[PDB]
Amino acid sequence: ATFEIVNRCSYTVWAAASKGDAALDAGGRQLNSGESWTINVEPGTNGGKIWARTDCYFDDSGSGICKTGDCGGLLRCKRFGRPPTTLAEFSLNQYGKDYIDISNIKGFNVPMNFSPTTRGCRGVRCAADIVGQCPAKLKAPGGGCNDACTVFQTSEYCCTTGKCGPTEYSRFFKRLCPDAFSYVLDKPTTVTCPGSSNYRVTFCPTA
């Protein structure tokens, strides 16, 4: 499948793409405002993620540090990023269907739009001012709005027993971005698309 990754933010972001155990394509790249990066992901990819990182320094060997979404200090991510990160998640060619969603289970950093560029399904979006409204206990000094698991490490917020309910924190993310997963057991806002679809992810889709 082809993913085009479009930075519509006024600020530079460092896009990242991984399936946890490896890079997807180059794994990461700088995107200045308006730039687009087209990547190829292998059919059958299960548990792929896309996100933006903010405020990154990298040396000439591709080593450094971002304030949100850092993936062990590399430009080209092999691993998932440090929260807070708004996540585009996908599993492709799963019994003939692709499954997409946006998640705030690991917090929020940049607003996003994750849509098909082929026919047969709808996109999803989380484009509210979650950082501006974030609660002080979840505000990340680095930038962004953490999830309450990250911060408090309780069974309830992390859903460690497999039984958990929504919370004051999860409801905050849900109130602002109802189409994004707000906690691990939220009613699914997964979208099922035809197998082998192509997509666009747009950072700051409205500004």
Curated annotation (Swiss-Prot):
Keyword flag Signal: yes
Disulfide bonds: 9-204, 56-66, 71-77, 121-193, 126-177, 134-145, 149-158, 159-164
Superkingdom of the source species: Eukaryota
Chain ranges passing through the membrane: none
PROSITE patterns on file: THAUMATIN_1, THAUMATIN_2
Annotated coiled-coil segments of the chain: none
GO cellular component terms, A-Z: cytoplasmic vesicle
Family membership: Belongs to the thaumatin family.
Its biological purpose: Taste-modifying protein; intensely sweet-tasting. It is 100000 times sweeter than sucrose on a molar basis.
The protein, known as: Thaumatin I
Organism: Thaumatococcus daniellii
